[PDB]
């Protein structure tokens, strides 16, 4: 049935029908346009009129322009043929390599896995990063969250994890470019063709790309997160594979929602956000999980507005994550990379039953002396180090060496840093920090611990510095 | 030893006051940022309330 456009204000568009009014979530094809425009139905205003959200620019639309109903939501291609192809929010290919030929399709909207379908097995995931594995270690088939402000190091950290974990893993992967730099999409695309994880000629690709970047309108950026999510669901359910989902950045899903909620005629919530901030995220985040049949290990980059973690958008996501990685600016500005905050990052698998009693005891020891070091900052600021007690000097000394030993050269950072990237095993990490806490390297300087792999290379670096006479 | 400690305490307390002055300056900026944010946020609640009537 045909429908007439009655109102157009930004991304939101109102379409009226005579008979056959389309339900909520259904996609609508706007006729008389050069490129394929898509309107998703959001509300039913009354008087046979429905409010919609446009998946592309609404410029050029005239009132009374005909709009056809597809009879379903935004349906997209899903399968082995999506691997090595770049998709947009409405399923179309944006890599100039013809159509994505598949024998089945799937709608972007779907109900989350039921309570009986949930999984229980919580196994540890070894990254290689020292600050991560010791304090807030990730889990296989879990939900990892990389919090960080503007330019702290989320896109570097996520690319390190893709370089290490997604390379050495017998299974498929998915990358969702949600509201970030299109330049970074081009860099990632060619870097993966170079490595071999994506292949143009062969059909042996491991990664599936979906992109709706910051040049796209709010309708696309609000729904492209679900588009890439739906690709991972196929491999989980119908195949039963171990999938790796990489969303950068998940904040843009919520931010895009805030831009349309104004135009949808809702009363705004705290800090100008939408009132449906938790529920819209809830229905989305709950789909990203490990079911009984398949499994998904999601690593989501999370932006933090104005370095404020109390902001609604990042504050809500914490509950949906198993392991958190709070990247601080103060830590980054000191030179400590990756700038993971050791008294903020947390994990649910951090338990003596899971990681072991030696892991848990050494984990709390690092956080204890770091907390004691932070507690004496007001005393060192005004009075000084001389005013501190003799035994307190020892606790401040080790904490700074522990802070610098938490830093680590990255593999992907080689291009600009210069230093070669390190990959420290789990057992060597626990051993290294335990020796510093026990006081086996109190004679060595601090700068020896700055940017090294295991503890062995820290001692060797001190001997190199010993040769400045 | 008497003249040594008085010269050292002079500079020690001089540094303490100058280090305190720097912390006051930065906290005064953080105070004024948070001052404005509270004024703006509280006002948006009142505008949000009036519009819903």
């Amino acid at each position: 049935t045909t429908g007439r456009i009655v109102a157009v204000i930004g991304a939101v568009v109102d379409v009226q029908f005579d008979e056959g009014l389309p339900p909520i979530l259904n996609a609508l094809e706007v006729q008389g346009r050069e490129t394929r425009l898509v309107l998703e139905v959001a509300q039913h205003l009354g008087e046979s009129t429905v409010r919609t959200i446009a998946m592309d620019g609404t410029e050029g639309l005239v009132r009374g322009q005909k709009v056809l109903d597809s009879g379903a939501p935004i349906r997209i291609p899903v399968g082995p043929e999506t691997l090595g192809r770049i998709m947009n929010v409405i399923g179309e290919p944006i890599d100039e390599r013809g159509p994505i030929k598949t024998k089945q399709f799937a709608a972007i909207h779907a109900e989350a896995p039921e309570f009986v379908e949930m999984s229980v097995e919580q196994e540890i995931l070894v990254t290689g990063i020292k600050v991560v594995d010791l304090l807030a270690p990730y889990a296989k088939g879990g939900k990892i969250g990389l919090f960080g402000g503007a330019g702290v190091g989320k896109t570097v950290l996520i690319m390190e994890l893709i370089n290490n974990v997604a390379k050495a893993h017998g299974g498929y992967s998915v990358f969702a470019g949600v509201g970030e730099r299109t330049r970074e999409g081009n860099d990632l695309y060619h870097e993966m063709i170079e490595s071999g994880v994506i292949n143009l000629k062969d059909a042996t690709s491991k990664v599936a790309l979906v992109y709706g970047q910051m040049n796209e309108p709010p309708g696309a950026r609000a729904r492209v997160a679900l588009t890439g999510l739906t690709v991972a669901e196929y491999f989980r359910d119908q195949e039963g594979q171990d999938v790796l989902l990489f969303i950068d950045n998940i904040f843009r899903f919520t931010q895009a929602g805030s831009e349309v909620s104004a135009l949808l005629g809702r009363i705004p919530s705290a800090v100008g956000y939408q009132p449906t901030l938790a529920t819209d995220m809830g229905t989305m985040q709950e789909r990203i999980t490990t079911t009984k049949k398949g499994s998904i290990t999601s690593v989501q980059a999370i932006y933090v507005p104005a370095d404020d973690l109390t902001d609604p958008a990042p504050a809500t996501t914490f509950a949906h994550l198993d392991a958190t990685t709070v990247l601080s600016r103060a830590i980054a500005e000191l030179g400590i990379y990756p700038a993971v905050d050791p008294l903020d990052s947390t994990s649910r698998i951090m338990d003596p039953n899971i990681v072991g009693s030696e892991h848990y005891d050494v984990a709390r020891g690092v956080q204890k002396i770091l907390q004691d070091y932070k507690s004496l900052q007001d005393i060192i600021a005004i009075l000084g180090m001389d005013e501190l007690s003799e035994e307190d000097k020892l606790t401040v000394s080790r904490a700074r060496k522990i802070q610098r030993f938490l830093s680590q050269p990255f593999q992907v950072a080689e291009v600009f840093t210069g230093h070669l990237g390190k990959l420290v095993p789990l057992k060597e990490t626990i051993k290294g920090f335990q020796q510093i806490l026990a006081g086996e390297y109190d004679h060595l300087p601090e700068q020896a611990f700055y940017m090294v792999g295991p503890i062995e290379e820290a001692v060797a670096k001190a001997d190199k510095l010993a040769e400045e006479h | 030893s008497t003249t040594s400690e008085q010269s050292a305490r002079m500079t020690a307390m001089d540094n303490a006051s100058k280090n305190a002055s720097e912390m006051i300056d930065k906290l005064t900026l953080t105070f004024n940022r948070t001052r404005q944010a509270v004024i703006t946020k509280e006002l948006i609640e009142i505008i949000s309330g009036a519009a819903a009537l």
């Binding site: 900052q377 060192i380 600021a381 000084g384 180090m385 000394s397 700074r400 004679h443 060595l444 300087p445 601090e446 700068q447 001190a462 001997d463 510095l465 010993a466 040769e467 400045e468 006479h469 | 540094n15 100058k18 280090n19 305190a20 720097e22 912390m23 930065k26």
Partner: peptide, 28 residues
């Protein structure tokens, strides 16, 4: 405070120099 970091880094740079002196003389 910035001068907190100034005094602390100064102290531990001096003590780092002392530790490198003991380390080099022990190395000989």
């Amino acid at each position: 405070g910035k001068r907190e970091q100034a005094e602390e880094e100064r102290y531990f740079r001096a003590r780092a120099a002392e530790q490198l002196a003991a380390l080099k003389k022990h190395h000989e």
